[PDB]
């Protein structure tokens, strides 16, 4: 912890004297004998998370279900739509289909 000299207000340093450890100024004679226990606790942040993920419900909390893919036609699906390329005047979609765990991903 920062502690400052009552005289000149520079920063104190800890050093050792002939009877005690002392807080001492570097620029004036002031010293302060450590007579008793003095402490400073940091209390850092612990690693709070454990973070298991990738569950199927964490995958299918998106709108689409019971639609039709051009590959395997299954109802349990995971869709996506893009538009952010205006060279593509048509729309952009991508689909995931996992009822039979077939796993297609096409345009």
């Amino acid at each position: 912890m920062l502690l400052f000299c009552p005289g000149c207000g520079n920063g104190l340093i800890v050093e050792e004297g002939q009877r005690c450890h002392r807080f001492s100024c570097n620029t004036c004679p002031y010293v302060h004998n450590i007579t008793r226990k003095v402490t400073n606790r940091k209390y850092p942040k612990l690693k709070e998370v454990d973070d298991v993920l990738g569950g199927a419900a964490a995958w299918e909390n998106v709108d689409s279900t019971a639609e039709s893919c051009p590959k395997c036609e299954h109802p349990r699906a995971y869709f996506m739509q893009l538009q952010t390329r205006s060279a593509d005047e048509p729309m952009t979609t991508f689909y995931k289909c996992c009822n039979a765990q077939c796993g297609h991903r096409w345009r």
């Binding site: 000149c8 002392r22 001492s24 004036c28 004679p29 002031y30």
Partner: protein
């Protein structure tokens, strides 16, 4: 006019908060060894603090 104040306060030496080993060295550094004609500190120690 052009109001500027300078003070000088006398700090003691008999208290435990005065490391005399460092005070003798800083008084030898600022003053001459035995000149004392004009001098920042009077004795052989840092006696004053100027404001």
């Amino acid at each position: 006019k052009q109001q500027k104040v300078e003070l000088e306060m006398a700090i003691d030496t008999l208290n435990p908060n005065y490391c005399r080993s460092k005070g003798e060295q800083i008084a030898l550094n600022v003053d001459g060894a035995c000149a004392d004609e004009t001098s920042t500190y009077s004795s052989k120690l840092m006696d004053k603090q100027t404001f």
